Amino acid sequence: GRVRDFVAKLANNTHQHVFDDLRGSVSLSWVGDSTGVILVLTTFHVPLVIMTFGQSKLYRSEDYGKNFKDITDLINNTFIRTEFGMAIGPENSGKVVLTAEVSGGSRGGRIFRSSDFAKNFVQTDLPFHPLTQMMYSPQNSDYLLALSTENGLWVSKNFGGKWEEIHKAVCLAKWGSDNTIFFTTYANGSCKADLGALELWRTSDLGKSFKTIGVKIYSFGLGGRFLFASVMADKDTTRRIHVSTDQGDTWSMAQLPSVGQEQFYSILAANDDMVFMHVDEPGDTGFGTIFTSDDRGIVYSKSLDRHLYTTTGGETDFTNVTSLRGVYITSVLSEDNSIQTMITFDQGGRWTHLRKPENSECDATAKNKNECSLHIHASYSISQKLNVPMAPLSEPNAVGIVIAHGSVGDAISVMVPDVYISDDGGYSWTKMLEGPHYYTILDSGGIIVAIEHSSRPINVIKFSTDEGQCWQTYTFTRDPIYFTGLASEPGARSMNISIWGFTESFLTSQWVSYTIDFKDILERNCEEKDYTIWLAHSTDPEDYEDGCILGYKEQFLRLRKSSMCQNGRDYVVTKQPSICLCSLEDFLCDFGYYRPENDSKCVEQPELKGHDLEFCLYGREEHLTTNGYRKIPGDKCQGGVNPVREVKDLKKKCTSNFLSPE
Ligand SMILES: *[C@@H]1O[C@H](CO)[C@@H](O[C@@H]2O[C@H](CO)[C@@H](O[C@@H]3O[C@H](CO)[C@@H](O)[C@H](O)[C@@H]3O)[C@H](O)[C@H]2NC(C)=O)[C@H](O)[C@H]1NC(C)=O
Numbered sequence: 001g002r003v004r005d006f007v008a009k010l011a012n013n014t015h016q017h018v019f020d021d022l023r024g025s026v027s028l029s030w031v032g033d034s035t036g037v038i039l040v041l042t043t044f045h046v047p048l049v050i051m052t053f054g055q056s057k058l059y060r061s062e063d064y065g066k067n068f069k070d071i072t073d074l075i076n077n078t079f080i081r082t083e084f085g086m087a088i089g090p091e092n093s094g095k096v097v098l099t100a101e102v103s104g105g106s107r108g109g110r111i112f113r114s115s116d117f118a119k120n121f122v123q124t125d126l127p128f129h130p131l132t133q134m135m136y137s138p139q140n141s142d143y144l145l146a147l148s149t150e151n152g153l154w155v156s157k158n159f160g161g162k163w164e165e166i167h168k169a170v171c172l173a174k175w176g177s178d179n180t181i182f183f184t185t186y187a188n189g190s191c192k193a194d195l196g197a198l199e200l201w202r203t204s205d206l207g208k209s210f211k212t213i214g215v216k217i218y219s220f221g222l223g224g225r226f227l228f229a230s231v232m233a234d235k236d237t238t239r240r241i242h243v244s245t246d247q248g249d250t251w252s253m254a255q256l257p258s259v260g261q262e263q264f265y266s267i268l269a270a271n272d273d274m275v276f277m278h279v280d281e282p283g284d285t286g287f288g289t290i291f292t293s294d295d296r297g298i299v300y301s302k303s304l305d306r307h308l309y310t311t312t313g314g315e316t317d318f319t320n321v322t323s324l325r326g327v328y329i330t331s332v333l334s335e336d337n338s339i340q341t342m343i344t345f346d347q348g349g350r351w352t353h354l355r356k357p358e359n360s361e362c363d364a365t366a367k368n369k370n371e372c373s374l375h376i377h378a379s380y381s382i383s384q385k386l387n388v389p390m391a392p393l394s395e396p397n398a399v400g401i402v403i404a405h406g407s408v409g410d411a412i413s414v415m416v417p418d419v420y421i422s423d424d425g426g427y428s429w430t431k432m433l434e435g436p437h438y439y440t441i442l443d444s445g446g447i448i449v450a451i452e453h454s455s456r457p458i459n460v461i462k463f464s465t466d467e468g469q470c471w472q473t474y475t476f477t478r479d480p481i482y483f484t485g486l487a488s489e490p491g492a493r494s495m496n497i498s499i500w501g502f503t504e505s506f507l508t509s510q511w512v513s514y515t516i517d518f519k520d521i522l523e524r525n526c527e528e529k530d531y532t533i534w535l536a537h538s539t540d541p542e543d544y545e546d547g548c549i550l551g552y553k554e555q556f557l558r559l560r561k562s563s564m565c566q567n568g569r570d571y572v573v574t575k576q577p578s579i580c581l582c583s584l585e586d587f588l589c590d591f592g593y594y595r596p597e598n599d600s601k602c603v604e605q606p607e608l609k610g611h612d613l614e615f616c617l618y619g620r621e622e623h624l625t626t627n628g629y630r631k632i633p634g635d636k637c638q639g640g641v642n643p644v645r646e647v648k649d650l651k652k653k654c655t656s657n658f659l660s661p662e
């Protein structure tokens with residue numbers, strides 16, 4: 001750390017706020033972007049019949065947590081149900097809805113709602129009792145939907161002032177795009193009893209009119225531009241996926257295996273181009289298979305086998321590395337029952353082990369002391385109570401930066417982990433810090449901050465202005481705190497960070513927060529001179545196709561490590577793409593085709609088995625005619641190879657084995 005006079009530039013920018021009360025469960029919510037508004041909520045028991053034996057305390061900051069004001073009187077100390085949480089409005093709507101507990105015998109529930117970033121609240125009594133949290137229509141923050149304790153679907157067009165029940169007997173409801181609502185309904189019995197017999201409904205006018213877009217429904221889900229629905233198989237207790245890209249007007253069967261009741265589907269990630277779908281393996285395995293879709297969400301390539309996804313807790317380590325296009329990391333179960341971290345750079349086209357740091361030696365999990373990989377601690381390691389304070393961290397505005405606890409060896413080890421960092425989207429790695437730490441990225445990567453994870457109280461904070469290569473430590477208080485967590489504005493564009501914890505026992509361990517402003521550390525604004533040209537996904541500069549991923553390269557401007565300046569709240573990631581010539585690698589095999597060990601070419605399958613044969617017989621005829629190739633979704637290559645073969649019909653092939661009637 002080459003920062004000069006850093007103590008003097010941070011001492012006057014460190015703002016302590018001690019919460020005198022705040023006893024118990026503490027909920028913290030940010031309200032909007034570029035507002036600095038933070039709500040802190042706590043609830044507790046009181047021996048007052050008049051309060052139904054409960055009260056809340058509610059604090060509000062509007063300077064990114066430097067100072068808080070007690071605004072409990074705005075909700076009349078009413079006990080707030082924290083299971084619902086604070087219902088925070090989209091982007092800068094400033095909408096806030098708290099769900100109160102009401103006494104016995106009430107007609108319906110009660111909410112406290114604010115439309116001005118919690119400066120004023122109004123009380124609203126509901127014609128129903130809410131069963132779920134209230135969901136904002138993403139397009140319009142005035143439109144809300146909620147299920148009632150009677151499984152009624154209620155909608156409000158005026159930010160919860162007035163509600164109407166648009167349908168009864170609803171199991172699950174979700175906002176689509178353009179203020180569209182999808183929901184399932186039950187008939188004879190309960191939602192569980194009518195599984196595989198539910199109906200899937202749609203309404204695009206907030207309940208004025210309805211359309212039934214699916215029958216024999218098990219459940220449904222949304223991902224990217226795709227609507228997925230699981231439907232029964234009439235003869236038995238199994239189900240399969242159908243997909244729609246037109247909000248349920250038309251459907252097609254997904255080329256994915258059917259599953260039983262004790263299996264599950266899980267959308268790992270989805271966008272405008274494709275979806276990552278996990279299919280649980282039959283049996284108590286704790287793993288499944290990742291499948292990647294084509295751009296229609298219909299034809300699926302098998303991407304990764306033995307993908308870890310436990311039933312107990314639903315723990316998976318699948319992580320979109322949001323700081324570099326096409327990069328995803330996850331954990332796989334080897335045959336040896338060990339857990340290995342895998343990384344893909346091309347959207348699940350190929351997976352490989354993570355390259356270990358050059359200066360790192362292998363741990364006891366590796367047979368060879370000098371040959372091993374880097375493995376990453378994520379949700380599963382945390383769920384298993386390993387000493388992992390945080391999961392991997394990446395931000396799209398901090399190009400290439402990835403931070404995670406890990407271990408260098410042949411499998412995820414149980415030892416107390418170090419923190420490792422990548423600046424190139426996961427191609428190369430360095431040990432960032434020794435031991436576990438909480439970490440946060442500020443100013444689009446202009447500053448990285450770390451807090452040591454310790455059993456004893458701490459009073460120091462580590463910061464780096466060169467993407468984690470050099471560090472300096474700042475004592476932010478003379479009264480050490482038992483650290484609990486960091487709070488910083490979502491989007492990693494602020495220069496404010498809030499350190500939360502409680503003081504030592506002799507001080508009644510009240511909650512306290514230290515908010516630090518790094519504006520005097522990054523006093524100078526970045527200029528053009530402080531940015532440098534960087535080709536993403538570079539592995540060999542002498543190669544003409546170096547950096548081509550899904551058919552194109554991207555060349556960035558990014559902040560020089562030696563440059564100590566502020567990117568700014570308005571910082572924009574600058575990148576330019578180079579359109580590579582198409583090769584066979586830019587195409588996936590269409591239905592009825594596969595790739596042999598021989599490179600590139602998609603060849604006709606000899607016989608269609610399992611779900612492939614079920615797709616052929618029952619699939620839509622349009623998808624059953626192809627030449628064997630489809631452009632990879634999101635692939636922008638131009639020129640070069642184009643498949644010569646014309647459109648061959650694959651359904652005659654599967655039906656040819658069956659004797660047909662007249
Ligand atoms: C993995 O994470 C990356 C980064 O978060 C995801 O890329 C992001 O995808 C979203 C949705 O497709 C993009 O938002 C869109 O931006 C365009 C602007 O061109 C806007 O017009 C759209 O309305 C939409 O808001 C976002 O820009 C994009 N971010 C980057 C850096 O490319 C990616 O989708 C994730 N992978 C999967 C499988 O979900």
Ligand SMILES: *[C@@H]1O[C@H](CO)[C@@H](O[C@@H]2O[C@H](CO)[C@@H](O)[C@H](O)[C@H]2NC(C)=O)[C@H](O)[C@H]1NC(C)=O
Pocket residue numbers: 036062063064066493494495496517569
């Ligand atoms: C760090 O926190 C301060 C709050 O103390 C933020 O200050 C705000 O800055 C914006 C933009 O300059 C002003 O419009 C607001 O009036 C400021 N708020 C206050 C209370 O003065 C500051 O923006 C934060 N730093 C970053 C990078 O977001």
Ligand SMILES: CNC(=O)c1c(O)nnn1CCC(C)C
Pocket residue numbers: 218219220221228229230241263264265266267
């Ligand atoms: C979390 N997974 C699920 O809720 C699930 C499941 O296991 N089967 N269908 N769905 C609904 C999801 C849609 C992809 C059909």
Ligand SMILES: *[C@@H]1O[C@H](CO)[C@@H](O)[C@H](O)[C@H]1NC(C)=O
Pocket residue numbers: 074075076112121122123
């Ligand atoms: C709080 O109590 C006052 C006084 O009884 C009442 O007027 C008000 O409606 C209540 N609710 C809110 C949100 O102020």
